[PDB]
Design a protein around this ligand. Structure first.
Ligand SMILES: [Mg+2]
Ligand SMILES: [Zn+2]
Ligand SMILES: [Zn+2]
Lengths: 901, 102, 203
């Protein structure tokens, strides 16, 4: 019984429609009356609808607040030109014969233009161009091809005055004003077949209807009297304009019926036209804006729509939606990735409506007995009829014994309910996801750490919002479409986006590091902590000196992987490619070598898993990191989403336990270098400075070759920058060479958990050149940056090259240069946000309508076909492996291993 | 040129970055001395006013608070004399003098 | 400004449109072409540049009619005296007002215009570089003292206007015998300090 508007076609109303659609013929300019009652025949009649309280509508019989209002019409004495259609009318007049009214065009031209219009229907711009071309062609013509009668030029005077420049018997050109009746007579004779070329539809917009003969009156609800603080019924501007229209119409009619002279009839006609134009649009060009009773321009129909806060552009907005909360977030890895911790106070306010049935009557009875204070309680109960009551304490004991099927209880949030989670600014799709509630004390939205990357959140004061869907359909949509599990693989690049970040990588490396063994106590404790379901330990690997059994980390990790997973790849720790070559040789030769042989050839740079057993390699970013998560991707794409969630939720806790109870830290001595490395760095710096000075001298004495792209100075600057960058790279290479892998900072950098090699270089060896907008520092005094350098100096030290690392400490000039660099970085960060936001807004406004049809095609909102078989292959980027439609190599290897095993 | 006058680090983050600054600890902001006393001083130093002569390629142009007031020769000697008088206590410390050889 | 053709122009804030440079110098009483050239320097290329500029002026205005032309730009009042007064007003109170507003100050403003034109010419020829707008030699700080000075100036102007209006109204509604009978109370009873107090406070 409830249908959905499938389309809206716009047209021009006909006078007959306005007459029959309307109910009351407004004739008397009557206001609200002294007693605030609707006067008969007034602007606010009772057939128009009632907004005043305590009376019934005449037409529908509805009380104020339930009567939608009804339309009325005004019978104009003389035709009036609509302001909006004035330009269209003028264009039409220049294209049709004065006598026949047909289009002044040859039949062949008509056929050609009709074909072109049929082809370019959809494209609005091309349609307008064709219309303008036809208008120009017709207007340029002088003799009607059908009648041969002359067509005196028509001149348009803004806003609604038309002049026909006619030639007298003496040849003088005089302007003859076209009265609206003449325009109507001209427009009526235009046949239907000529309308499509003229830019019209002969079923919804006829040219005769552009000139108004009947003016509809909006209902009282559309023009309500907002009243005033004093009680004065502050009227609507539309009401005042309608009153003036009625007065002028009656005056014009009575003078017409009294045989008045033509001049006064013309005066009243023009007054009516001006009033109508200012009522439709009070800001129409060439129209004096009508003043309110206070002397301000009246807001009219045009102004009521073209407002940023009006119906257009105003309904779309962001306001305080119901059932929402906002607070800071704190981390906790003890909950599953698809769970969120909610404070008790929030849970006691964001109620969710639940209808009581046979299988949940007792739970709701207990909840309503708890009242609105105990946590598992309710705040409102709705009877089957529809009244709402607050539980409180007076009637807490009742409303439970009288609660049966058909009631509705607004219980508090409980564990398992579905809830959305948002972080602003919301950039991509993953910024809103659905979580499961887990009510815990204190006041913070607890969030699992593996879910941080998609949200792009850090626990340094960031705030998040959650919304609680109310209806069952919304809850089902959130649960099935929006859960965190389904969004492991990012739609952008087809790889994972949920995975370990900082400890989940470093601790994994510590666990799987070569030569790492654990005692029985640690093994049992970490397995129980991770939640892994086990009941007997595997066979010990290697015995302690005093006789205690030991277990290598690789087997413990292998206890998590599925029973038939098999994969091999090269991680980021590969520094001796020969060993990787040997392992690849063996694996490719056999496809299933005996695990004993692999043990002798094991190397932590080459991960190899056979039937769920980790035989070689170590865990790093490429295992289950933010991107390139080979193992996590394999689990997602081969064992289903639930298995992937379980694997992530176990490996996270296991790695956290091992890093917590194994010890991980960093001190000031993590970037202490031996004396030889310091001497090497010092001599590198000195040599680079010497070369720079040599370049400067060569430039000074005219010995320089300017490449075509640059002048002498620009070439000099390019050479200097290249030399300094190469020197910094050499120093970094030396520092990296002398820093061992056992160093914790080096571990963090190499595994990719956090930081880059450049950070170690800057902190230990050398900071390097400082630049602004890709150029050497130059903005300062005349010829020098600081005041402590000789003017006209281009040496490396004097233009932003700093030679002290963070450990050694910066001299004041170096400190100032570093400040310049940091300020530039901050400014760039500040501006790029706005620029990217603008670009994204443009792209979304352009592309947010495209969708995949049921036949695989992608169609524009106006019906144009944009793409057959979306993506030219039909593969969702999420489902794609890494861009490839099907990774047939993995398929071949996996099937061969499964069936040959 | 912000060295010693504007703190190079303390600045808000966001739209106001760089546009809002804080004075350095050694910074000192000056007030104004009566300008006609200073003008009388430079005139006594021997700068012939612009009404009696015109700028020439071999003449130095003297500006006071940005307005040309006369011409002189050997501007270096003039600025040396003014500085010596400033640190001899003859005139106030508000006066600052610089010359451009270019 | 120096256009791409080499012809100089001056942009007065009140005058809606730029004026040619030699016209402006002649309006300030500097009429001699030799003196106009001398006021900007003696470098021969600069001399030739201004020879071209005065040739562009074509001696259309030599002593007068420059003020009349300016009056043509600045809302001509259709009267010789009206155009003359408008031209001299915008000349005195909008061409370097820091040099003074008396008609005598025009001859002094001529030299400043000349040195500005010399700066523009030197920049055109590359003899001097651009001026760095961020250099603190070119920046000043508006302290609390001068801001208070400006606010107090505005408030005091308002108070003076109110004083004049109140004095005029009281005289016209009471007659001569009261005003000059005892001027002290007459002056004292027209102050209305609340205008000043509320203006400064709300600012
Ligand atoms: Mg943050
Ligand atoms: Zn009704
Ligand atoms: Zn015809």
């Amino acid at each position: 019984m409830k249908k959905v508007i499938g389309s809206i076609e716009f047209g021009i109303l006909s006078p007959q429609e306005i007459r029959k659609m309307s109910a009351v013929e407004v004739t008397v300019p009557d206001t609200y009356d002294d007693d605030g009652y609707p006067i008969e025949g007034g602007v606010m009649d009772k057939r128009m609808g009632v907004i005043d309280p305590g009376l019934r509508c005449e037409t529908c019989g509805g009380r104020a607040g339930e009567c939608p209002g009804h339309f009325g019409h005004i019978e104009l004495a003389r035709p009036v030109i609509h302001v909006g259609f004035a330009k269209t009318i003028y264009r039409i007049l220049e294209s049709t014969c004065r006598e026949c009214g047909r289009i002044k065009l040859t039949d062949e031209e008509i056929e050609e233009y009709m074909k072109k219009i049929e082809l370019a229907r959809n494209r609005r711009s091309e349609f307008n161009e064709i219309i303008k071309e036809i208008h120009k062609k017709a207007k340029e013509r002088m003799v009607c091809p059908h009648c041969g009668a002359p067509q005196y030029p028509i001149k348009f005077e803004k806003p609604t005055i038309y002049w026909e420049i006619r030639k007298d018997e003496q040849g003088n050109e005089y302007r003859h004003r076209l009265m609206p009746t003449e325009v109507r007579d001209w427009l009526e004779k235009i046949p239907d077949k000529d309308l499509p070329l003229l830019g019209l539809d002969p079923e919804k917009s006829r040219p005769e209807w552009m000139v108004l003969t009947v003016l509809p009156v909006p209902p009282v609800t559309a023009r309500p009297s907002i009243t005033l603080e004093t009680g004065i019924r502050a009227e609507d501007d539309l009401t005042h304009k309608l009153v003036d229209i009625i007065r002028i119409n009656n005056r014009l009619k009575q003078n017409i019926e009294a045989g008045a002279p033509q001049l006064i009839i013309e005066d009243l006609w023009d007054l009516l036209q001006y009033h109508v134009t200012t009522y439709i649009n009070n800001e129409a060009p060439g129209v004096p804006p009508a003043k309110h009773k206070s002397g301000r321009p009246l807001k009219t129909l045009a102004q009521r729509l073209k407002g940023k806060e009006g119906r257009f552009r105003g309904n779309l907005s962001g306001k305080r939606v119901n059932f929402s909360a906002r607070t800071v977030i704190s981390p906790d890895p003890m909950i599953s990735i698809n769970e969120v911790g909610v404070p008790v106070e929030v849970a006691m306010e964001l109620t969710v409506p639940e209808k009581v049935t046979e299988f949940n009557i007792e739970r709701l009875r207990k909840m309503v007995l708890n009242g609105p204070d105990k946590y598992p309680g309710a705040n409102y109960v709705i009877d089957p009829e529809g009244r709402r009551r607050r539980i409180m304490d007076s009637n807490k004991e009742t409303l439970a014994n009288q609660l049966d099927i058909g009631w509705t209880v607004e219980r508090h949030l409980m564990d398992g309910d579905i809830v959305l989670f948002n972080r602003q600014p919301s950039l991509h799709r993953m910024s809103i996801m659905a979580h499961r509630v887990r009510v815990m004390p204190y006041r913070t939205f607890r969030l699992n750490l593996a879910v941080c990357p998609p949200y792009n959140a850090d626990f340094d004061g960031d705030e998040m919002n959650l919304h609680v869907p109310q209806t069952e359909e919304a809850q089902a949509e959130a649960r099935i479409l929006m859960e965190v599990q389904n969004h492991i693989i990012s739609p952008r690049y087809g790889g994972p986006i949920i995975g370990g970040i900082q400890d989940h990588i470093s601790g994994g490396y510590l666990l799987t590091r070569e030569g790492a063994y654990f005692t029985r106590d640690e093994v049992e404790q970490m397995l129980m902590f991770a939640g892994v379901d086990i009941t007997e330990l595997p066979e010990p690997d290697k015995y302690d000196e005093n006789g205690n059994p030991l277990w290598s980390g690789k087997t413990i990790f292998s206890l998590l992987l599925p029973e038939d997973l098999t994969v091999w790849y090269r991680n980021k720790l590969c520094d001796e490619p020969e060993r990787c070559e040997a392992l690849e040789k063996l694996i490719e030769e056999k496809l299933m070598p005996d695990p004993e042989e692999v043990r002798k050839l094991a190397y932590d740079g080459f991960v190899y898993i056979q039937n769920g057993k980790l035989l070689s390699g170590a865990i790093d970013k490429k295992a289950y990191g933010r991107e390139d998560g080979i193992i996590l991707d394999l689990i997602v794409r081969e064992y289903g989403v639930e298995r992937a969630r379980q694997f992530l939720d176990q490996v996270t806790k296991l790695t956290i336990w091992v890093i917590t109870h194994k010890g991980f830290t960093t001190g000031i001595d993590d970037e202490d270098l031996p004396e030889e490395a310091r001497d090497r760095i010092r001599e590198i710096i000195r040599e680079a400075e010497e070369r720079v000075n040599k370049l400067i001298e060569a430039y000074k004495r005219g010995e320089l070759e300017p490449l075509p792209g640059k002048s002498l100075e620009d070439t000099l600057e390019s050479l200097i920058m290249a030399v300094l960058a190469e020197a910094r790279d050499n120093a970094g290479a030396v520092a990296e060479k002398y820093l061992g892998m056992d160093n914790h900072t080096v571990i963090m950098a190499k595994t990719g958990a956090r930081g880059k090699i450049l950070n170690i270089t800057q902190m230990a060896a050398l900071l390097g050149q400082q630049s602004i907008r890709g150029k050497r520092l130059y903005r300062g005094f005349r010829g020098r940056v600081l005041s402590h350098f000789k003017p006209g100096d281009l040496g490396a030290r004097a233009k932003g090259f700093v030679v002290n690392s963070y450990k050694s400490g910066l001299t004041p000039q170096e400190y100032f240069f570093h400040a310049m660099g940091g300020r530039e970085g901050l400014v760039d960060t500040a501006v790029r946000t706005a620029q990217s936001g603008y670009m994204q807004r443009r792209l979304i406004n352009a592309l947010q309508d495209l969708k995949v049809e049921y036949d695989g095609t992608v169609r524009s909102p106006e019906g144009i076909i944009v793409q057959f078989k979306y993506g030219e292959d039909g593969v969702d980027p999420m489902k794609s492996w890494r861009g490839k439609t099907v990774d047939v190599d993995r398929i071949i290897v996996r099937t061969l291993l499964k069936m040959r095993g | 040129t912000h060295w010693g006058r504007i703190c190079p680090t303390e600045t808000p983050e966001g739209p106001n970055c760089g546009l809002v600054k804080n004075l350095a600890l050694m910074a000192q902001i000056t007030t104004a001395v009566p300008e006609e006393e200073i003008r009388e001083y430079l005139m006594s130093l021997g700068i012939v006013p612009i009404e009696v002569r015109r700028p020439d390629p071999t003449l130095w142009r003297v500006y006071l608070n940005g307005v040309l007031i006369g011409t002189i020769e050997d501007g270096k000697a003039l600025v040396q004399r003014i500085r010596q008088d400033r640190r001899s206590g003859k005139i106030s410390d508000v006066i600052n003098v610089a010359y451009y050889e270019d | 400004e120096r256009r791409k053709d080499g012809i100089l122009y001056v942009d007065i804030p009140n005058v809606p449109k730029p004026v040619k440079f030699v016209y402006v110098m002649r309006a300030l009483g500097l009429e001699r072409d030799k003196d106009i050239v001398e006021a900007v320097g003696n470098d021969p290329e600069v001399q030739q540049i201004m020879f071209d500029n005065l040739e562009d002026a074509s001696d259309i205005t030599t002593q007068q009619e420059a003020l009349e032309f300016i009056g043509k730009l600045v809302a001509p009042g259709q009267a010789r005296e009206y155009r003359l007064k408008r031209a001299e007003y915008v000349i005195d109170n909008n061409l370097l007002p820091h040099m003074g507003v008396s008609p005598e100050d025009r001859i002094k403003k001529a030299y400043y215009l000349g040195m500005m034109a010399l700066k523009v010419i030197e920049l055109s020829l590359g003899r001097r570089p651009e001026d760095d707008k961020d250099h603190y030699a070119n920046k000043r700080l508006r302290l609390a003292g001068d801001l208070l000075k400006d606010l107090f100036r505005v408030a005091f102007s308002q108070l003076v206007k109110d004083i004049q209006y109140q004095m005029t109204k009281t005289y016209q509604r009471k007659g001569d015998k009261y005003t000059f009978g005892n001027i002290h109370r007459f002056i004292r009873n027209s102050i209305r300090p609340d205008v000043l107090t509320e203006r400064i406070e709300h600012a």
